Amino acid sequence: TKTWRRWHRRVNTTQKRYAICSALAASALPALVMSKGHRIEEVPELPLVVED
Amino acid sequence: APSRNGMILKPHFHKDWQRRVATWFNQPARKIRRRKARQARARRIAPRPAAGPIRPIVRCPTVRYHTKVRAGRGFSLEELRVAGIHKKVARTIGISVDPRRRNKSTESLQANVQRLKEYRSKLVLFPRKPSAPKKGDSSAEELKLATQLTGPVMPIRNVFKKEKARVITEEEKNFKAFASLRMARANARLFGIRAKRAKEAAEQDVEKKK
Amino acid sequence: RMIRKMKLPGRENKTAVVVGTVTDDVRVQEVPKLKVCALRVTSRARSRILKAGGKILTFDQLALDSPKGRGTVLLSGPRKGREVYRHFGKAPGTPHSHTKPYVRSKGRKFERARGRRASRGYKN
Amino acid sequence: PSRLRKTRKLRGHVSHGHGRIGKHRKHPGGRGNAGGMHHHRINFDKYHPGYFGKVGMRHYHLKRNQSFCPTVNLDKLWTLVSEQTRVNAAKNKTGAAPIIDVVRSGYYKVLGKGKLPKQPVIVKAKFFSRRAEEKIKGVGGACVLVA
Amino acid sequence: SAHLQWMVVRNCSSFLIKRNKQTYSTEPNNLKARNSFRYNGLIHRKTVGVEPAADGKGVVVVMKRRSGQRKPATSYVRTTINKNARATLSSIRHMIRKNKYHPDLRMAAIRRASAILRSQKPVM
Amino acid sequence: ACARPLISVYSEKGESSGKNVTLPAVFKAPIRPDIVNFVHTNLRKNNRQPYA
Amino acid sequence: LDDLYGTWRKAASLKSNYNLPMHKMLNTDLSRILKSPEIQRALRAPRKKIH
RNA sequence: UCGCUGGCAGUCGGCAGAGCGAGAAAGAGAGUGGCGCGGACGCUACGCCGCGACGAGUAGGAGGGCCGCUGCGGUGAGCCU
RNA sequence: UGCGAGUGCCUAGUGGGCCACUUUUGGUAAGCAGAACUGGCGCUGCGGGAUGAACCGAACGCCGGGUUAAGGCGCCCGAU
RNA sequence: GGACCAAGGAGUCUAACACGUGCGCGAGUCGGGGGCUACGAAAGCCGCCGUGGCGCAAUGAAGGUGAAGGCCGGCGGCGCCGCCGGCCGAGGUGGGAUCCCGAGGCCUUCCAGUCCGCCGAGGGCGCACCACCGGCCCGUCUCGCCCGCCGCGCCGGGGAG
RNA sequence: AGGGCGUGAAACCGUUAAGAGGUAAACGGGUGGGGUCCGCGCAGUCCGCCCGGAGGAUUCAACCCGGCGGCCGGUCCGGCCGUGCCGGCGGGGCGGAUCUCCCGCUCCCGUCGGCGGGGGACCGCCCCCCGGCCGGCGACCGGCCGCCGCCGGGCGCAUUUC
RNA sequence: AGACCCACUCCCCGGCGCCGGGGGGCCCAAGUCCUUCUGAUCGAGGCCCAGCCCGUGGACGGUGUGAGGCCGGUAGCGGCCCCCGGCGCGCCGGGCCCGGGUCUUCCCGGAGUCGGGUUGCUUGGGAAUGCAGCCCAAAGCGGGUGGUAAACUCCAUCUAA
Ligand SMILES: [Mg+2]
Ligand SMILES: [Mg+2]
Ligand SMILES: [Mg+2]
Ligand SMILES: [Mg+2]
Ligand SMILES: [Mg+2]
Ligand SMILES: [Mg+2]
Ligand SMILES: [Mg+2]
Ligand SMILES: [Mg+2]
Ligand SMILES: [Mg+2]
Ligand SMILES: [Mg+2]
Ligand SMILES: [Mg+2]
Ligand SMILES: [Mg+2]
Ligand SMILES: [Mg+2]
Ligand SMILES: [Mg+2]
Ligand SMILES: [Mg+2]
Ligand SMILES: [Mg+2]
Ligand SMILES: [Mg+2]
Ligand SMILES: [Mg+2]
Ligand SMILES: [Mg+2]
Ligand SMILES: [Mg+2]
Ligand SMILES: [Mg+2]
Ligand SMILES: [Mg+2]
Ligand SMILES: [Mg+2]
Ligand SMILES: [Mg+2]
Ligand SMILES: [Mg+2]
Ligand SMILES: [Mg+2]
Ligand SMILES: [Mg+2]
Ligand SMILES: [Mg+2]
Ligand SMILES: [Mg+2]
Ligand SMILES: [Mg+2]
């Protein structure tokens, strides 16, 4: 094995941003958080926002 | 061995390319080191600009690039003396100088002179001895207000002369661009040989008349 | 293409349907009123169509509007417009075959001498 | 990923997909693209006409900066300025013609391919073609040369 | 929506069990516990669950309300029923049928309730 | 969809405050697990040290 | 957050040039679409008898 | 296995009315005048179901592996003196 | 009379063959050397030829019942 | 080749190219080099950091050139070119999935007539693609007649096949 | 785990037990016999409804009080939103290859003409306030009314219910 | 260099003293609480209405299995103690008595080198890119270069040894 293997990968910025938007969108659906496994049965509102 | 339709290639891998392979695994480390050194320099020269001395307006050489301007090496001696700064004082007050650069035209000369004079009007000069102000120094009001500026000292921005809508003149309508271009080509190509034939005909005329 | 095929006679105020992508074309000046249904539309194409006063639909809205797809003109893009297709067919260097060869670079010194001229040997 | 490739399915098959009559030897035809003239002649003739031989002049120190001249077409001519310019020019009844300077956009030569909308223009370029100039004349407008 | 969330979680949920050529869902409000779009207890706009009571007597029926879909705390209303088997079954059947509350699985609900009561019965 | 609800800001004590903000459109952006996976897979190899 | 990523009509304020990605289909609720009068109208009768 | 690129969103239920296999296109069409509270299973649609025909194989090609080994990110309120 | 067709890419292995009825060249001849047509063996198991690469029959998913092909029915060995 | 058993043991990595698939954007696209803000040597941002690459135009050895036309009205030298002004303005034939129209017709007593749905002889506008015919750009050949001017020239431009 | 001592496999060997033994052995198909273990086998399934007989309960239907929930108001009232629109004697940010008052500079005997910038108007987009339509509240509701259901508590008193 | 105008006394170092990063050393939170498994507990359960205590410290290692609270550490612009340097300050002493503009008059450069012939190596450098050997051997408006050998003639750009 050589050190000059292709270790790093490149992805387009537009779909980096697309995926981050997708993750934020999916973080605000209660069934998806439950499926991921977090215990949120007693959270008041799912997009949980607090004071500054 | 060649196969069905494809491209025939020439890989330059017949030397011993593996005993010298330059990897870039230390690229982030080099970037961090460069920026740390940059910050150290910026704070060792306390009130001076981080990017260094001011630099003049320059046209790019070739036909491919001669419509753009950029930053040069230093201000030339001719424009420097037109502006009135001394050769040994320009770079001690923060003006780049190069004695190698000519000045062919006058508009570029004047633009660089305007830039130099505006910079001189803008800069703030601290006293050599803090408690002993002198003739050319700046006053305390702006001494307390002096600070560093980031990036190039005066960004060189290329702008385009705004041209507004006009009525079309019948002369401009009658102008024949393609014909003029082709005739300019022909004249430039046949200039010398026409001159030689003219000289030869004049000579034949002189021994016909003499 | 969409404007031309929709201004062909007879098919007035029908819904154009594309199962591909509607891209913008900058070498067209006047945009009529259009009723497009498409999988995706580029931003400038959307701006042009909406400013001209058209309506853009997704396929769920198309299904709701017309389950049988009646009143629709189904179009597609040129399928052999890709650069790959000029390399196909009868092999280059074969009589009467205007096939694009695979050359590393185009120029004076690259694949222009012996099967191409008539002086250098023969011409295909 | 090595999981998805072909070597994983060939475990247990003796020849690894290279046959048993003619084995996988090392270089059964010569290195690289040798034998182009001798035993790969018909491959080279059948897919690479003109590969062998010389043609044309030589240019010892060629400069692409000297030979640099990008082109633009009358189709794309109106794209080089904002559509506000075109709308205002068409709206205005005075008769003023907008100036389209293509050197600013980065083009040197104007070639006339497609239609041109019925609107006066002053095209300010470095070179022109005869057909482009005639189309600009026909729409009604000027071609001004710059150096 | 329900179908979109189902496409997301049909194979990548922490409630999913895959062994012995069998598939199951361990989410709280899944009758028959099987991985299915119909019986899934999370992705649906309205759903019902049947659980054993906290103490060893009766059954808890959990109803999903309509308004607070994004508010998990006040989204499920509970009702403990401690009667004989026949009246408990009748109460569940009425709760589903005469409210028209997701009626595709009333039979499954009463199956689960009867199983839970049979389990609560003393063993020999 | 297009309708954006109004999420309340929760005080540190746990109960809802008097303030609330509308849902940003990021939470209504489309959700695509396939290219979320693609972007995660490709970016996750960028912190990997070489070995040989 | 909406300054970072923009809205459906407003571009991002602190990106160079970024807008939200478009939707291939707006109404994803398939059951509501299928059991709607418009589609139920233009359908043939189901053939659910097994032969 | 292949084909039919066949069928199934109609679980349309007291706000009810149970159908879509039968030689021969297309309406279980709308309107205008002349008590007892009840009804199995199903549909991970990447699923389920129904008919037909087919099944040799070295070199080689392709597909599926809820076959197997080691390590990483998630997850199983996983297992274990 | 029978049958759903057209069309484009990328492509591995192969490029030592052998046998048989009829045609056939060299040779005294050959289990010899060289051709034509078709079918086989190579890549193929199964019933018969006692035994056999190519002969006769017949081509193969795992099974129950029935019937045949070629070849057989004194005993080995199923069947006069 | 092989006494027997255990462990190890052979299509890998880099670069280039070609095609097929999947994703994002789309006449554009791409920061990879640089710069700014424990995991993190990651991630985020830059747009007057798109320099640049590939694409968007080809052809010729090169100097170089570089991708529709027709009609109306009259004149100058029947037609033709130009002055002009206007008008139309970006091919044609065959085959084409789909779409459009519709002679009529789809029963529960009989007639007339309304609405909706449906089937439908025949007729249309025709996607992508294939075949063919024309047209335009560059090189080259043959035959010809006109036009332009700052320098009327061993000049420049134009036509038909 | 007894000083080369964690676990302790295979080839090979010793012994014990069982079986067998003139076509080297081993192998496929079909049974048969014998063993070692398992079934915790050894009088053999339950599950609903109904009939009959003995039982035992705080016991059913109906009615009242309270709470919660699901669906509606042909058009109840009030909100919020729109990847909608229309207005505006509205208050702003972004951009523009759309136009035009002041400053700086250069060339001219306080002056004419020129260059850079600032300012102003205009256009497009966006945000916010006002008013009006349209659509939604099934990715996004509150109150009153009406119906229905469930739960808790009284009342029910035994041909009911269990 | 001279002459005339304008301006100027803020430079440096050697010592001495004074004011505000590095190296080393020693330290800094909280359960061995109750019950129960074990050969040994760091396991299991519990510790309220403060869901035991600390947490800017839940990295790691040790300790009779598996420990945030038993120990060392970890966190902290945390503490204390020594030594070295710098950027700063003052004092002593020493070094120099120093500029710019305008006019006039003068001065101005590197040879066995360049260059040429030939030979050998080298380079993408092709009628010879670079280097070297031997022979010839310079000039001063000269010389070098201006990617094809040569002559003539204008330009451009540098100033070798
Ligand atoms: Mg090959
Ligand atoms: Mg094989
Ligand atoms: Mg192969
Ligand atoms: Mg072999
Ligand atoms: Mg081979
Ligand atoms: Mg061979
Ligand atoms: Mg090979
Ligand atoms: Mg097979
Ligand atoms: Mg033979
Ligand atoms: Mg063989
Ligand atoms: Mg075969
Ligand atoms: Mg055979
Ligand atoms: Mg025999
Ligand atoms: Mg049989
Ligand atoms: Mg016999
Ligand atoms: Mg041997
Ligand atoms: Mg391709
Ligand atoms: Mg031991
Ligand atoms: Mg041992
Ligand atoms: Mg033994
Ligand atoms: Mg014995
Ligand atoms: Mg430990
Ligand atoms: Mg504990
Ligand atoms: Mg602990
Ligand atoms: Mg520890
Ligand atoms: Mg401690
Ligand atoms: Mg400590
Ligand atoms: Mg520390
Ligand atoms: Mg060499
Ligand atoms: Mg020359």
Side-chain angles (χ1 to χ4, degrees):
Chain A
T1 56
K2 305 295 192 294
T3 65
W4 52 83
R5 184 186 292 173
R6 210 161 65 82
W7 289 107
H8 302 70
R9 292 292 186 272
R10 218 160 83 73
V11 297
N12 294 349
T13 314
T14 304
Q15 57 187 356
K16 291 185 177 72
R17 297 160 166 181
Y18 182 77
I20 201 67
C21 294
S22 179
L24 268 68
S27 69
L29 290 172
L32 298 168
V33 178
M34 294 299 291
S35 313
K36 185 70 182 264
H38 296 297
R39 298 292 301 274
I40 61 165
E41 295 86 3
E42 294 83 6
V43 174
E45 176 164 21
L46 183 66
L48 190 38
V49 65
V50 303
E51 292 179 353
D52 291 331
Chain B
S3 182
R4 300 180 186 91
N5 190 2
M7 179 171 314
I8 49 179
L9 304 158
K10 298 293 183 182
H12 294 55
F13 282 124
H14 301 85
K15 308 174 165 183
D16 209 312
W17 60 279
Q18 298 197 15
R19 293 184 293 176
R20 59 190 73 87
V21 168
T23 58
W24 281 54
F25 293 132
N26 65 320
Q27 188 194 18
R30 182 170 62 246
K31 290 182 73 173
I32 294 170
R33 185 194 310 131
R34 287 177 164 180
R35 74 191 309 268
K36 287 175 70 175
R38 196 167 315 122
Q39 303 191 8
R41 178 185 155 73
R43 78 167 86 91
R44 66 183 180 179
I45 50 181
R48 298 177 183 88
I54 189 180
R55 282 153 196 293
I57 310 297
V58 175
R59 272 271 202 272
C60 314
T62 61
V63 186
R64 176 160 174 190
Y65 291 111
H66 71 293
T67 49
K68 295 189 291 183
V69 294
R70 65 154 159 83
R73 180 72 168 88
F75 290 81
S76 50
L77 268 65
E78 198 206 74
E79 68 202 59
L80 191 63
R81 74 177 65 252
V82 167
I85 300 96
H86 200 210
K87 218 165 55 174
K88 312 309 217 264
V89 181
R91 69 189 68 181
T92 199
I93 75 176
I95 294 169
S96 63
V97 190
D98 57 348
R100 286 191 297 274
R101 188 168 67 85
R102 298 173 315 270
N103 276 267
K104 275 75 66 179
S105 83
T106 313
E107 293 83 3
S108 53
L109 174 66
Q110 296 294 321
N112 275 335
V113 163
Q114 295 297 109
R115 180 191 191 66
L116 201 54
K117 292 192 287 187
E118 197 290 336
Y119 167 81
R120 185 80 176 73
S121 68
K122 182 170 303 261
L123 71 88
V124 176
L125 211 50
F126 282 56
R128 194 72 182 110
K129 182 60 66 179
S131 66
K134 298 294 182 180
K135 277 74 69 177
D137 291 331
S138 296
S139 66
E141 182 65 26
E142 62 284 28
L143 287 178
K144 280 73 176 175
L145 295 174
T147 188
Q148 298 216 18
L149 73 165
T150 53
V153 65
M154 293 180 183
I156 293 173
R157 188 183 296 270
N158 63 6
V159 294
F160 320 98
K161 181 173 72 175
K162 183 263 186 181
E163 182 65 26
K164 64 181 292 295
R166 270 186 298 121
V167 300
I168 303 171
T169 296
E170 69 275 16
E171 293 179 353
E172 293 179 353
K173 289 172 73 174
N174 281 12
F175 178 59
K176 297 166 165 152
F178 181 77
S180 59
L181 278 166
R182 304 283 316 151
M183 293 177 71
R185 297 285 177 88
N187 282 41
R189 216 192 48 247
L190 311 191
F191 176 51
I193 190 67
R194 269 202 208 101
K196 184 174 76 70
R197 309 180 159 114
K199 291 174 70 175
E200 294 294 328
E203 294 293 328
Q204 276 92 72
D205 218 335
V206 306
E207 69 273 15
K208 290 180 176 66
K209 299 293 187 291
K210 272 72 152 184
Chain C
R1 281 187 180 273
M2 182 179 72
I3 291 169
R4 295 173 67 249
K5 301 295 184 288
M6 294 299 291
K7 70 170 69 174
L8 273 187
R11 48 185 69 163
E12 182 65 26
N13 63 24
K14 295 158 93 174
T15 288
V17 165
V18 190
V19 192
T21 301
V22 167
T23 55
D24 184 28
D25 187 308
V26 298
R27 66 180 189 274
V28 65
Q29 297 294 321
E30 182 65 26
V31 186
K33 180 180 183 294
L34 291 171
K35 182 67 68 69
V36 188
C37 178
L39 282 183
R40 63 184 292 272
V41 194
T42 54
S43 56
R44 293 179 293 173
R46 294 181 66 92
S47 182
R48 292 280 281 281
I49 295 169
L50 295 177
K51 206 70 164 203
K55 179 176 208 164
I56 300 170
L57 281 75
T58 61
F59 267 79
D60 55 355
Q61 316 180 237
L62 179 86
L64 273 190
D65 186 74
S66 63
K68 293 179 184 291
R70 64 180 61 254
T72 59
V73 178
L74 181 56
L75 319 165
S76 67
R79 200 168 290 205
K80 295 180 75 71
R82 291 187 315 142
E83 190 276 331
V84 72
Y85 279 106
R86 291 180 291 178
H87 285 307
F88 294 161
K90 189 165 180 284
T94 300
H96 310 117
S97 77
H98 314 296
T99 304
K100 211 188 175 303
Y102 289 114
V103 289
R104 180 182 57 189
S105 65
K106 184 183 285 186
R108 194 256 310 179
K109 281 183 300 172
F110 313 114
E111 304 210 6
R112 277 204 146 73
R114 189 207 163 212
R116 299 296 217 199
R117 297 296 160 132
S119 73
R120 269 71 172 177
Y122 65 94
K123 184 159 155 82
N124 55 351
Chain D
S2 67
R3 292 176 280 101
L4 297 176
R5 70 178 65 255
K6 214 180 144 182
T7 183
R8 312 305 317 160
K9 297 291 181 70
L10 282 167
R11 290 308 200 214
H13 313 76
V14 192
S15 299
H16 214 287
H18 288 282
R20 311 155 82 107
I21 302 99
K23 274 74 71 175
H24 185 197
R25 285 285 147 78
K26 297 189 74 66
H27 285 101
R31 301 290 187 94
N33 53 15
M37 287 271 185
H38 297 277
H39 54 293
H40 305 140
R41 202 201 191 73
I42 64 179
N43 195 296
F44 274 75
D45 288 14
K46 185 151 142 55
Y47 304 105
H48 302 303
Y51 173 68
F52 296 118
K54 289 144 65 154
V55 58
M57 279 158 182
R58 278 171 299 155
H59 207 56
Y60 284 159
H61 182 220
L62 190 148
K63 282 168 256 156
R64 302 290 175 89
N65 284 44
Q66 272 165 266
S67 67
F68 169 91
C69 179
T71 64
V72 71
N73 270 296
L74 267 60
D75 291 331
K76 303 294 188 291
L77 204 48
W78 267 109
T79 316
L80 310 159
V81 299
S82 70
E83 69 275 16
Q84 183 177 138
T85 299
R86 199 168 55 74
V87 176
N88 284 2
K91 179 173 69 67
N92 170 26
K93 187 59 70 177
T94 290
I99 320 296
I100 307 298
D101 189 358
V102 310
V103 181
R104 177 200 193 141
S105 295
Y107 299 106
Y108 279 14
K109 189 177 178 69
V110 186
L111 300 171
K113 183 180 176 180
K115 289 293 288 292
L116 194 62
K118 280 73 176 175
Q119 205 160 357
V121 289
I122 313 293
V123 170
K124 188 181 291 294
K126 191 180 292 292
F127 305 92
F128 290 94
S129 66
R130 185 178 64 81
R131 296 180 192 57
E133 183 178 1
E134 66 183 1
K135 305 199 168 182
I136 292 151
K137 293 291 294 297
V139 65
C143 285
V144 295
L145 284 173
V146 300
Chain E
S1 68
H3 288 271
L4 188 153
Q5 295 174 65
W6 170 245
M7 299 303 258
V8 180
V9 309
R10 44 162 300 261
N11 203 6
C12 188
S13 160
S14 68
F15 304 120
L16 172 71
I17 307 188
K18 280 209 243 182
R19 65 171 65 95
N20 290 134
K21 278 74 175 175
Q22 308 163 37
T23 312
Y24 302 101
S25 179
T26 59
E27 65 183 1
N29 282 324
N30 197 299
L31 314 180
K32 291 183 180 179
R34 54 148 77 95
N35 179 245
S36 198
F37 168 73
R38 192 168 292 243
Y39 289 124
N40 170 277
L42 284 195
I43 63 171
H44 279 286
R45 185 172 179 267
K46 53 174 45 163
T47 186
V48 64
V50 166
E51 301 313 320
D55 55 354
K57 298 296 181 183
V59 292
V60 177
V61 172
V62 169
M63 295 299 290
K64 190 174 181 181
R65 67 159 76 248
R66 189 183 69 187
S67 67
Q69 294 297 110
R70 71 184 186 275
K71 295 183 176 68
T74 64
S75 180
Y76 295 92
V77 293
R78 298 184 107 88
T79 302
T80 301
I81 300 171
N82 192 330
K83 293 179 180 179
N84 64 7
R86 185 173 292 115
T88 48
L89 266 52
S90 69
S91 297
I92 279 175
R93 179 185 299 120
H94 286 172
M95 279 178 106
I96 292 170
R97 194 193 290 281
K98 293 186 183 297
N99 310 343
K100 295 179 185 292
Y101 191 87
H102 188 193
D104 62 358
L105 61 83
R106 69 152 164 72
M107 258 306 312
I110 62 170
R111 296 287 180 87
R112 202 192 164 79
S114 68
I116 293 186
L117 268 69
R118 192 270 184 195
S119 66
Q120 284 178 3
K121 286 173 68 176
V123 68
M124 183 177 176
Chain F
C2 68
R4 284 151 92 230
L6 189 62
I7 297 89
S8 74
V9 167
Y10 267 97
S11 176
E12 68 182 3
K13 298 291 180 68
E15 67 274 14
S16 174
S17 179
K19 296 150 307 163
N20 53 7
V21 308
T22 185
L23 187 73
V26 184
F27 300 104
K28 298 293 183 182
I31 296 167
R32 292 193 66 187
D34 57 310
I35 65 174
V36 162
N37 182 11
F38 173 82
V39 179
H40 175 81
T41 300
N42 285 28
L43 288 179
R44 183 175 171 267
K45 323 199 190 154
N46 284 312
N47 65 61
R48 197 181 35 178
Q49 287 203 27
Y51 62 76
Chain G
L1 193 63
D2 63 358
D3 291 331
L4 261 68
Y5 292 166
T7 70
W8 287 120
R9 295 178 69 185
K10 174 161 72 133
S13 162
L14 57 87
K15 297 290 192 291
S16 177
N17 189 0
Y18 188 75
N19 295 291
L20 277 296
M22 300 315 302
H23 272 271
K24 287 183 174 64
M25 65 180 288
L26 293 176
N27 192 2
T28 59
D29 175 11
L30 192 62
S31 294
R32 186 70 180 270
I33 298 170
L34 292 178
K35 66 183 75 172
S36 66
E38 295 295 327
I39 291 174
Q40 285 291 320
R41 193 186 175 81
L43 282 190
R44 65 141 157 98
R47 294 179 293 173
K48 60 174 69 66
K49 169 173 190 53
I50 311 191
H51 285 103

